[PDB]
Design a protein around this ligand. Sequence first.
Ligand SMILES: COc1cccc2sc3nncn3c12
Lengths: 198, 195
Amino acid sequence: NLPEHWTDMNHQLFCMVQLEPGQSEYNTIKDKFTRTCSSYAIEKIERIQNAFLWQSYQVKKRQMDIKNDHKNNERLLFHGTDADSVPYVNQHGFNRSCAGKNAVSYGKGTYFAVDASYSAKDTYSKPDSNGRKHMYVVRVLTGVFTKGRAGLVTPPPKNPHNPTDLFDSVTNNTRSPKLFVVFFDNQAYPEYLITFTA
Amino acid sequence: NLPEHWTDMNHQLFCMVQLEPGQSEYNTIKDKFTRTCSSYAIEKIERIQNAFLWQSYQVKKRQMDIKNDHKNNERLLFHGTDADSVPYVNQHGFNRSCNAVSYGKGTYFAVDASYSAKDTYSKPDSNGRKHMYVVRVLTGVFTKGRAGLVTPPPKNPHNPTDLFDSVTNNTRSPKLFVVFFDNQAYPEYLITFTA
Ligand SMILES: COc1cccc2sc3nncn3c12
């Protein structure tokens, strides 16, 4: 069930794997980051191998793939974090109950950015005592989405006369999405941790 | 991998199945309720057949069975719901983001049906009908809760990310459990009843 490219974790359930510059895997993430964060410098990129988070995420993805009509349900997005949160996210993923209020709120959930520049703001990727900033690269089940609203604690219904049939996520703008908000556990898999500095 | 006791769903993924009174399954669930709620009249008991919620719950159960290195992680508990919330719970299960919550900001489950039978939880609808779930809950290894928790405490603060599975009001004689994650609770039956 675990991806074949992962390092052997010899019965362990969790490993952070340091990537090598020059490998396609490192270079693709560096390029995705530098597209909007060219003024910052990457210290390192770690692949997050969390068996339990992966299993629960892949179950949710299979369900969304069944429910939705041949939709690309998954986007690769960014999430800036403070150093104090990194151990919890690595082990347990993204908990909406711990999320800050966003400067522009489209609901009470976990926020993910299309552009690394957004997540690179000190408000999200707070510099630690050594000047290191931390950003996850995250597989997010955006599914079918609509423009969010500050009051939401779950995604809104697609149809007001069927209140239980929900959008998968919300966004700031359906025409030009720059952020997505998810409201359920195991809808986002933290795949890489970028450590970076000015 | 849907349970044998489920009945065929004609290739659908969600069904509420009304149980036949006086058959073994109805009798078992009725007895669990009447242990503390024998003064309440049961209108019906429905089996909740939600393939997606069951899948996600069974994955969490398998994980908790590995993590705890032992397999007594599940309890059968009660939860009272207002009528307006029953369709959401049937389809999406319990949501901590949706009464006093003095043991933490999670989903609450009662050991005794009598606790969930309070009108503050199982709010009577226009017709006096009250609604209570019988819930499979992954209580796992638990500790005493306290106000304002957003996750269970660590089992050892040397390792702040290795958490208890749930919290309770009283570890020696628990009457309520709180879980803080989606898919730690599977709503298995819905009881419709009157005072
Ligand atoms: C203390 O118990 C609850 C606190 C908050 C909500 C509920 S819904 C329910 N059903 N049985 C008990 N509860 C509770």
